[PDB]
Symmetry: C2
Subunit: 95 residues, 2 copies
């Protein structure tokens, strides 16, 4: 199995990518305070492990605050936006 | 906030370390198939995010299998052992 450490946005997001039978392709990581735009290939399932994300999805008007334990889905071939206050850890699965 | 990518055991365990108000000092990471010995400073709380860990704690005879969603605690200044089958992601908090 391959594990790889990845960084994005000048080090404000860092993650470990992997692949397993139960998750498919996935990454766990952390984001620090900031505002981020992400683009998807495959649809993504995001789980907030600790902290919180303010989430703007392309097909719905309102931002929504996702605190620890919550799960959201992003469509494929899309753009979504996040806002982060305190360091926030997450699991992302590429569906 | 600081985020740092860490690797252990010749790259078989990789994690992102961070610190937040809700977690204290912590790391999220992934372990691949193998058998690992860890030593603690502070007590640690481990949450299995995906996959599974076979866990041997110093003060109890039996190994126990912790699958996704489960949480265990390791005392401070101790040694514990893990066995991993498929890539397994986790949250570790330094209590």
């Amino acid at each position: 199995s391959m594990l790889q450490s990845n960084e994005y946005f000048s080090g404000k997001v860092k993650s470990i990518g992997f692949s397993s039978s139960s998750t498919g392709r996935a990454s766990v990581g952390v984001m620090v305070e900031g505002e981020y735009t992400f683009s998807t290939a495959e649809p993504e399932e995001m789980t907030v492990i600790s902290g919180a994300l303010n989430v703007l999805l392309p097909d719905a008007t309102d931002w929504q605050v996702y605190e620890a334990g919550s799960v959201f889905n992003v469509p494929g071939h899309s753009e979504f936006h996040l806002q982060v206050a305190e360091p926030t850890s997450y699991l992302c699965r590429y569906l």
